[PDB]
């Protein structure tokens, strides 16, 4: 009663606690060992940064039971506006002691006012300065401290290990983790503190800097005592948004902290942080759903972008089944980047808007539900830092503004991104409500959230651990596992970092967590470490625990190589995941830790593995894994040699193939995969299996696990994208097996005969095997083939249907809704002159059909599986979607047929048969089945910009063309600095963002989408908005786009007000006519806008809506008029044979011969005579413009100034070019015709035009040395550092051709003197070979500056 101390007891320890303060005097373990707490009378409580010392009257004590005591602390300071009552609980269980703040009463406040209003006098922070919950002294045997801080740098360890001596002096030294050891005991301190502090290396904030342990020294008699305390806790924090508005936000959780006292837990004869770390796992926070991390063998990204629907959800489910077959059912983790709105970086931050063109929430739920049966987990990429005007969440309150009141702009790509006010988004409850919208859609089906960019300071200048903890909480509260971008981010709750798992990003300073303490504690809970990537060195040079190496094959950054994806899983990820099924118990001889980097007391042992690195791991059943390094010397070939043992038996050995792709290794393994792909429980003894891999290929012998020792044989299967193949029965003798393996080929070993994993391809897709993933057998079991030709499944990467000759491939459609409207589209690449078709039939009769002749447009969709960088045939891909539209029959009898009509040997490729509900009804046909009219408001587009297809203005790219969406007023002209409407009519339009000055096609129709019959006339019209005059043009062409072979009509500015365009088109003789939008060489008028306003304004954009194409009546012609038109054309051009290109004459003869076929056919009609006449009229206007172009080239070359002015007035194109790209400007600059150069530039000639060799007019101005022409070109915007085919800048051609004063002019305008030719030649080296002495010394003076 009078005694100022009490005792709490467990079966493991007795703790003496003080009655006048929640402090421990000491912990006494059952064996008599003692650990100190706070030996001194320290009664400090910090509130809001003010230290208050408590007296006897400020504390009441109550011993609740033998395991618990409660304290009531009166914490008061009138001068600092603090009057609080803190209730503190101390509880003990086993070797653990918990200290919890269970109640905080503020006497100076009524609470947080509604809506998170400011709470005056709020208790914002709380801590117990120098509480010393556990402590060690310099007088104790082997007294030491081990601490960890965040490091994303492979060369800078995050740990410190030092002896605690009389000279140790620290005051609130902060760490993520801190452990003290001394006198045979070790302990770590755990806290839920959101404090941010000291770190070793990190490129971002976002929870990277969370330090929760404070170490402080004090004198205890003649010894120095080092004590551990919790870092401060946030309670009711007051924050400010980007507009100056203040809020008080309640605590994420109440303050909590704990210690766990360890003896020699790993039984190795030494007591250090590792023993404390083993006990620490019993008290530490564990990231939500971290127990499934060892199961996630196959991580990858499935991408959608720019309205294209490259990866609809039901296709993602088929790719999950393909990976399940190839890995024998290992767990997967599929990150859906672009699951929402129009795709990736569209619709942020509308978390609940699931991409309707992908199949919406219904297909997403089917993919998640069915995928989970194959151990596949799914998650979505979200952004809480940047938003687009189209998102319904976009509002003035959501907008982050700068100190001047302007928008905090983000990135412009498809649309202009704007920063989100992170503090407003949290304190208003907006973000959590948007996550609730997504929760209503996915229920409990979704595994995780991937939070992009958090920590890069785009939402505010803070994004601290407190904000990150609340962000992770609102996500975990919906049943979602937390994952994020940056390697160092969110130490508290993240189970995956993209910049840790994908080792190629960021470089050596910005990878996963480089800490032995953190990885010892949590390797099994996260994919947030440093894997093998030897060019980074240090931590990335063959980590013994491996580390996740992530590759993709579904479009992310153009990644499409399935074989490389699977090879990578077996090379690094199977052993990494195997190791994660065990927890580290011992880690000695770490070569990254030295006396020089603050780790003199690092855990060492010369009697373990020759004094080289070794890690021991164990599971809860007592299974033991030992991972050993061959040598600790990085110069030794043995540094990268690793052996893995499972229960004393070797299961892996050798050097892994370098994680950076630089060198193949020799590693082989026979890993026992004992777990299921769901919760990771042990599978039944009979279905236990082994995975075999042999990097170089060959024969290796292995000792089987103990439970296999009495078998006489095993079954071995080679794993492919079809599952288990090539079964072999391999004898077992003396419990050993010998395996012959091909290089880099996976095998699975079973005790007896194994069954094939059952796969029903394309569930929910209305056809079986819509992606041709079922091998050759799919053409027997699923699709029916008929005809004399050939149908085969081709392609070692993304398999396709390949047709040759006359062949039909059919399949009945299932699960259609009778009477409902459907679109059916299929990817088609036709290399044949004969038609490739898609037909839907019902009871023998045709409901819908469509065809394409030879494909004319290459595929430039980077996230798509058959873009032109994927080699469908001959190093290209012309894959484009071909649509049919039908109403599902009442009889429920519908069949799709894919066919090749011609009997030639050329190929047709098909892939991804997609049957989708769709209400589009804008096509009308003539009685013959030809086009009568096509209208499109883009309101019912199944995907893409149909009837247009993205062209090559940006090469294979995540193309800056998509379907724009209405969200007034933010998407309309007049909001902020925006001058163009995103949408012209309804909710959707086709938008082109900033594709100015490309001098090439942006998008075009193709015949499979809109067929223009040979000789027929069509009126085409559309509504548009264009940012400036003549930046975009209407293009009309025939066949595959060829520069010079198209008709261009510049469009005038329509900025903020919708313009109307209309023109006529006559179909070309080959049925391959098209129209599109073209980016000219004309510079946009930015109207004095600067910075982000140049992109957000719309000056460089083009929006198109309400397309209308209609067949029109043409004046009727007789056979005689058509024949006379032939004679007129022949009289005008038959003589110009020599005056024409060999290709120009053949194109002329082709049109002529084909027009005559129409005229002279037996039974021809007035329609044929009219078509032949219209074809000849179009041919006439084309040949007449070609002649004016070559006459303008001749007049610019020969210096006929008057001829140039009159030729352009008649119709010569100022940007005309010969077969080799030589323009009139190239010709006048080379010839020295200054006035012609100026007139051409005034008319709109492209100053930076390239010829086939990359030579610009400025390059050609250096052959003779025209000084005045170089000045004019430079003044008009010529690139002074333009490099041609041989790497020569204009400076290299002037010095090589010996023209001194041109060089002087080039050097003045900013021609970088450091620039190197295709050889090792600077402009100085070019003058040495041509005697240009005065040039050499002049640029030598400029280079020294």
């Amino acid at each position: 009663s009078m005694v100022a101390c009490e005792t709490l007891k467990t079966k493991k320890m007795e703790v003496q606690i003080k009655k006048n303060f929640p402090s421990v005097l000491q912990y006494t373990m059952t064996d008599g060992k003692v650990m100190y707490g706070q030996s001194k009378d320290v009664r400090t409580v910090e509130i809001n940064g003010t230290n208050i010392e408590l007296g006897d009257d400020d504390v009441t004590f109550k011993k609740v039971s033998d395991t618990e005591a409660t304290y009531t602390l009166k914490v008061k300071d009138e001068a600092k506006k603090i009057d609080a009552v803190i209730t503190v609980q101390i509880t003990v269980k086993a070797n653990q002691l918990h200290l919890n703040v269970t109640k905080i009463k503020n006497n100076l406040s009524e609470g947080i006012p509604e809506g998170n209003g400011v709470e005056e006098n709020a208790i914002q922070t709380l801590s117990f300065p120098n509480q010393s919950l556990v402590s060690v002294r310099s007088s104790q045997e082997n007294a030491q401290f081990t601490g960890a801080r965040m490091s994303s740098n492979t060369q800078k360890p995050g740990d410190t290990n030092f002896a605690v001596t009389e000279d140790t002096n620290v005051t609130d030294s902060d760490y993520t983790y801190g452990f003290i050891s001394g006198a045979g005991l070790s302990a770590g301190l755990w806290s839920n503190s959101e404090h941010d502090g000291t770190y070793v290396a990190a490129p971002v904030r976002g929870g990277s800097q969370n330090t929760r342990v404070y170490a402080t020294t004090q004198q205890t008699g003649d010894a120095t005592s080092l004590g551990l305390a919790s870092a401060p806790w946030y309670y009711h924090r007051t924050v400010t948004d980007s507009k100056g508005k203040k809020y008080t936000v309640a605590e994420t959780a109440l303050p909590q902290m704990a210690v766990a006292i360890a003896g020699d837990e790993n039984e190795d004869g030494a007591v250090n942080w590792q023993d404390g770390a083993i006990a620490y796992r019993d008290i530490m926070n564990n990231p939500y759903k971290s127990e499934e991390v060892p199961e996630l063998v196959a991580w990858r990204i499935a991408m959608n972008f720019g309205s294209q629907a490259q990866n609809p959800f039901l296709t993602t489910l088929d790719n999950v089944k393909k990976v399940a077959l190839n890995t024998d059912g290992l767990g997967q983790s599929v990150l859906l980047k672009g699951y929402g709105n129009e795709g990736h970086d569209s619709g942020h931050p509308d978390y609940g808007d699931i991409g309707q063109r992908l199949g919406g929430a219904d297909d997403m739920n089917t993919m998640m539900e069915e995928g989970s049966k194959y151990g596949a987990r799914f998650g979505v990429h979200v952004n809480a830092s940047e938003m687009y005007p189209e998102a319904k969440a976009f509002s003035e309150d959501m907008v982050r503004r700068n100190s001047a009141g302007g928008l905090s702009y983000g990135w412009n790509w498809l649309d202009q991104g704007v920063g989100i006010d992170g503090i407003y988004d949290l304190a208003s409850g907006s973000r959590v409500s948007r996550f609730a919208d997504l929760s209503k859609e996915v229920g409990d089906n979704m595994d995780f959230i991937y939070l992009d960019v958090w920590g890069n300071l785009t939402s505010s200048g803070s994004e601290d651990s407190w904000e990150t903890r609340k962000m992770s909480k609102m996500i975990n509260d919906n049943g979602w596992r937390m994952t994020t971008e940056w390697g160092s981010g969110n130490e508290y709750d993240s189970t995956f970092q993209h910049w840790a798992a994908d080792l190629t990003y960021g470089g050596y300073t910005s990878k996963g967590e480089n800490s032995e303490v953190m990885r010892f504690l949590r390797n099994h809970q996260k994919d947030s470490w440093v894997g093998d990537y030897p060019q980074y060195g240090g931590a990335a040079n063959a980590p013994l625990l491996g580390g996740y190496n992530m590759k993709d094959f579904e479009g992310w950054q153009g990644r499409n190589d399935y074989a490389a994806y699977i090879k990578n899983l077996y090379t690094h990820d199977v052993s990494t995941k195997f190791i994660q099924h065990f927890k580290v118990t011992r880690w000695v001889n770490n070569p990254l830790l030295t006396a020089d980097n603050g780790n003199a007391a690092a855990v060492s042992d010369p009697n373990t593995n020759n004094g080289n690195e070794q890690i021991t791991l164990k599971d809860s059943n007592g299974n033991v894994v030992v991972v050993s390094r061959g040598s600790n010397d990085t110069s030794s070939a043995a540094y990268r040699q690793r052996t893995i043992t499972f229960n004393g038996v070797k299961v892996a050995s050798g050097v892994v193939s370098a994680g950076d792709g630089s060198a193949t290794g020799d590693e082989s393994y026979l890993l026992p995969w004992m777990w299921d792909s769901f919760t990771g429980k042990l599978v039944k003894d009979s279905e236990q299996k082994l995975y075999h891999w042999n990097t170089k290929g060959g024969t290796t012998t292995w000792t089987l696990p103990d439970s296999w020792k009495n078998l006489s044989s095993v079954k071995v299967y080679q794993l492919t994208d079809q599952g288990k193949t090539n079964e072999q029965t391999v004898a077992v003798s003396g419990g050993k097996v010998t395996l012959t393996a091909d290089a880099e080929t996976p095998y699975v070993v079973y005790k007896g005969e194994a069954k094939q994993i059952q796969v029903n391809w394309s569930e929910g897709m209305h056809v079986v095997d819509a992606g041709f993933n079922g091998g050759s057998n799919t053409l027997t079991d699923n699709w029916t083939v008929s005809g004399s030709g050939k149908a085969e499944v081709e392609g070692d990467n993304n398999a396709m249907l390949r047709l040759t000759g006359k062949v039909d491939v059919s399949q009945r459609l299932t699960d259609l809704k009778a009477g409902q409207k459907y679109a059916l589209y299929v990817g088609v690449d036709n290399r044949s002159t004969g038609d490739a078709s898609v037909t839907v039939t019902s009871g023998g009769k045709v409901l819908a059909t469509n065809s394409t002749g030879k494909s004319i447009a290459k595929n430039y969709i980077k996230a798509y599986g058959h873009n032109t960088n994927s080699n469908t045939e001959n190093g290209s891909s012309y894959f484009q979607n071909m649509y049919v539209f039908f109403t599902a029959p009442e009889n429920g009898d519908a069949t799709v047929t894919l066919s090749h009509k011609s009997t030639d040997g050329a190929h047709t490729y098909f892939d991804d048969v997609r049957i989708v509900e769709n209400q589009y009804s804008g096509i009308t046909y003539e009685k013959d089945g030809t086009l009568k009219s096509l209208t499109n408001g883009f309101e019912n587009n199944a995907q893409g910009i149909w009837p247009f297809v993205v062209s090559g203005s940006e090469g294979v790219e995540d193309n800056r063309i998509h379907l724009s969406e209405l969200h007034a007023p933010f998407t309309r002209a007049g909001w902020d600095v925006k001058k163009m409407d995103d949408v012209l009519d309804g909710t959707w339009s086709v938008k082109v963002n900033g594709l100015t000055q490309k001098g090439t096609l942006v998008y075009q129709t193709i015949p499979q989408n809109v067929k223009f019959e040979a000789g027929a006339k069509y009126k085409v019209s559309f509504d548009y908005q264009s940012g400036s005059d003549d930046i975009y043009a209407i293009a009309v062409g025939q066949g595959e786009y060829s520069a010079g072979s198209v008709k261009l009509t510049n469009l005038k500015k329509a900025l903020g007000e919708t313009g109307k365009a209309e023109f006529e088109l006559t179909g070309g003789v080959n049925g391959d006519s098209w129209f599109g939008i073209y980016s000219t060489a004309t510079a946009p008028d930015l109207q004095g806008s600067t910075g982000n306003a140049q992109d957000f304004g719309g000056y460089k954009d083009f929006v198109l809506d309400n397309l209308k194409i209609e067949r029109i009546e043409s004046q009727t012609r007789t056979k005689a008029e058509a024949q006379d038109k032939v004679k007129e054309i022949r009289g005008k051009y038959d003589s110009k044979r020599a005056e024409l290109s060999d290709a120009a004459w053949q194109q002329y003869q082709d049109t002529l011969v084909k027009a005559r076929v129409l005229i002279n056919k037996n039974g021809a009609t007035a329609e044929d005579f009219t078509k032949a006449y219209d074809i000849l009229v179009a041919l006439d206007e084309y040949m007449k413009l070609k002649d004016l172009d070559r006459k303008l080239l001749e007049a610019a070359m020969d210096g006929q100034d008057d001829e140039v002015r009159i030729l352009m007035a008649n119709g010569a194109d100022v940007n005309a070019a010969d077969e080799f790209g030589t323009t009139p400007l190239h010709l006048a600059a080379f010839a020295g015709h200054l006035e012609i150069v100026e007139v051409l530039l005034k008319t709109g000639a492209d100053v930076n035009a390239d010829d086939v060799l990359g030579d610009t007019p400025l390059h050609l101005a250096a052959y003779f040395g025209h000084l005045e022409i170089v000045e004019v070109l430079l003044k008009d915007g010529a690139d002074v550092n333009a490099q041609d085919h041989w790497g020569w800048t204009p400076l290299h051609l002037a010095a090589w051709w010996g023209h001194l004063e041109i060089v002087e002019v080039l050097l003045k305008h900013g021609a970088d003197v450091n620039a190197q030719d295709c050889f090792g030649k600077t402009p100085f080296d070019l003058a040495i070979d041509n005697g240009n002495e005065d040039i050499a010394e002049v640029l030598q003076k400029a280079a020294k500056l």
Binding site: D1251, L1253, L1260, Y1263, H1285, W1286
Partner: peptide, 9 residues
């Protein structure tokens, strides 16, 4: 006259 035949001289 583009670079090809110009270089050749």
């Amino acid at each position: 006259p583009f670079l090809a035949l110009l270089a050749a001289x």
